[PDB]
Design a protein around this ligand. Structure first.
Ligand SMILES: CNC(=O)c1c(-c2ccc(F)cc2)oc2cc(N(CC[C@H]3OB(O)c4ccccc43)S(C)(=O)=O)c(C3CC3)cc12
Length: 545
């Protein structure tokens, strides 16, 4: 079956689209090589359509059915509840896309009669009708990158009223089921500090550890009708209210398995027979499906004492080594099994015998040292995309502030501390907006966060050591330095000089501002001060504050 069929109608924008990096008076202080930064637009949608459109073949063996039975047994222990209309409304992001039927996200959150009445009618229709395909909108995403250009990603989502009903039927399920079914392998349960701890402990638990990442090419398109029905069967193992069972069946048949694609202008663009990127079950569904296929593939490859870590379509396996030649051979069998299950890799997997050489979710483990000189592990990444997006956000206000999300999730890194913290606190100081809450995304979920609360947030997610890490590895430092030269960002020595100023400015204001100065920028001073004291919903339209 083809992942998509297309009519020929274009994927259209709903507003003006900027591809070129916007520039203001602050831009050059961060980044000089402006032509290297670009944003994707609907003009490349055609290119993406070609990439994501292909035939899927699936051959399912006993390993697959064995693992599925085990997952269902665990799912059978979960008890999930329906959320009320009111609870589902409160989880709706303030700036979520408005309904076609005369109400928006703020109406939903406020429990307006019009919004609530339509939600009730959508819900009743889900109970009464388990066959009629539900409409979806297809859009090209606008995302910023550094050159070497990517074509726009496509997103597919149903109407607001449907999105609220998804929460009612499935929010409790997708929040609780994955951890029970997959145990320690469910990647979204960890904070960055907890994840690093798990990865290190998993590596040390093996006598002779080997590990590899496996990244499937266009995962959403490899997801078949079978996969989505198997996914439903796992959900239905839960102890559920009868009304929830019906709604989950209806949503699966009418939305999750596939449906018609409509552009922003209301024209039929085609039909989908694979994963929709913008439904509540996207993250949970991808995690379960990846875990199922990969667990079965481990058995086919006879990999010994496997510990898997899965988040959406991202996969890492750490296991007992059988020797270099033997490990390489076993990965070939693993990939052959995954391919039979419909999930071939973008690049063939490579066995690694050092934890730090494995990259997943664009990230790798690295080592620094705390004040006492003890080794502290932390997750980092190539800073190119974070810095490209920071430059865009310096000149343009955007729906999501990636810089804030990056500071929070990569707070221990030398690039987040020296560049992102220094740059944006200077900007916030100049506009007196330190107390202004900003929208950002952590693990696909939307959060409203004031910059002044960053010290407490960082401490809780990474520990107090995030404010005193030093003696970073030569490889990490070189990667950062190389990226700065590439983008025309000033060298780290300049940022240290700037941070002393920003620190001094923050201390001068007292209160929570001074606390930001003290903890976030203690790295910048020569004589240091004494420093003292969730889940995954990518595309799921989820909000917390
Ligand atoms: C299966 N792989 C994993 O669970 C992860 C690994 C990993 C595992 C094994 C290895 F050997 C090496 C690395 O590294 C990871 C790094 C992340 N980072 C999230 C960063 C990024 O993702 B989000 O879309 C996002 C949003 C805002 C800012 C940053 C991010 S995070 C916040 O630093 O932990 C995550 C987030 C849950 C998605 C997951 C993993």
């Amino acid at each position: 079956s083809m992942s998509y069929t297309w009519t020929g109608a274009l994927i259209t924008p709903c507003a003006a689209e900027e591809s070129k990096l916007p520039i203001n008076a602050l831009s050059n202080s961060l980044l000089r090589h402006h032509n290297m930064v670009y944003a994707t637009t609907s003009r490349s949608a055609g290119q993406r359509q070609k990439k994501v459109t292909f035939d899927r073949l699936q051959v399912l063996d006993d390993h697959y059915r064995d693992v599925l039975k085990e997952m269902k047994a665990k799912a059978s222990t979960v008890k999930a509840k329906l959320l009320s209309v009111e609870e589902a409304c409160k989880l709706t992001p303030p700036h979520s896309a408005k309904s076609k039927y005369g109400y928006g996200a703020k109406d939903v959150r406020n429990l307006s009669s019009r919004a609530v009445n339509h939600i009730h009618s959508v819900w009743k229709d889900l109970l009464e009708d388990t066959v009629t395909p539900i409409d979806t909108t297809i859009m090209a995403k606008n995302e910023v990158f550094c050159v070497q250009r990517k074509p726009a990603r496509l997103i597919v989502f149903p109407d607001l009223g449907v999105r609220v009903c998804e929460k009612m039927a499935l929010y409790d399920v997708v929040s609780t089921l994955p951890q029970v079914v997959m145990g320690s392998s469910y990647g979204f349960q960890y904070s960055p500090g907890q994840r690093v701890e798990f990865l290190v402990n998993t590596w040390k638990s093996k006598k002779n550890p080997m590990g590899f990442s496996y990244d499937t090419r266009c995962f959403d398109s490899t997801v078949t009708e079978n996969d989505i029905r198997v996914e439903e069967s796992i959900y239905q193992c839960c102890d559920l209210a009868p009304e929830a069972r019906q709604a989950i069946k209806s949503l699966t048949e009418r939305l999750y398995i596939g449906g018609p694609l409509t552009n922003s202008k209301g024209q039929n663009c085609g039909y989908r027979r694979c994963r929709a990127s913008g439904v509540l079950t996207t993250s949970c569904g991808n995690t379960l499906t990846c875990y199922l296929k990969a667990s079965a593939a481990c058995r086919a490859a006879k990999l010994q004492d496997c510990t898997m870590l899965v988040y959406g379509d991202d996969l890492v396996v750490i296991c007992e080594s059988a020797g270099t030649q033997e490990d390489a051979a076993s990965l070939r069998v693993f990939t052959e099994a995954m391919t039979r299950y419909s999930a071939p890799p973008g690049d063939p997997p490579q066995p690694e015998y050092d934890l730090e050489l494995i990259t997943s979710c664009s990230s790798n483990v690295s080592v620094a040292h705390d004040a006492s000189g003890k080794r502290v592990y932390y997750l980092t990444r190539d800073p190119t995309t974070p810095l490209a997006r920071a430059a865009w956000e310096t000149a343009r206000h955007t729906p999501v502030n990636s810089w804030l999300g990056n500071i929070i999730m990569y707070a221990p890194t030398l690039w987040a501390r020296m560049i992102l913290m220094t740059h944006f606190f200077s900007i916030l100081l100049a506009q007196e907006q330190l107390e202004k809450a900003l929208d950002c995304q952590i693990y696909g979920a939307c959060y409203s966060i004031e910059p002044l609360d960053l010290p407490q947030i960082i401490e809780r997610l990474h520990g107090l050591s995030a404010f005193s890490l030093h003696s970073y590895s030569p490889g990490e430092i070189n990667r950062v330095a190389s990226c700065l030269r590439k983008l025309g960002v000033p060298p780290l020595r300049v940022w240290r000089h700037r941070a002393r100023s920003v620190r001094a400015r923050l201390l001068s204001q007292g209160g929570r501002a001074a606390t930001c100065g003290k903890y976030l920028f203690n790295w910048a001073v020569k004589t240091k001060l004494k420093l003292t004291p969730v889940a995954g919903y990518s595309g799921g339209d989820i909000y917390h504050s």
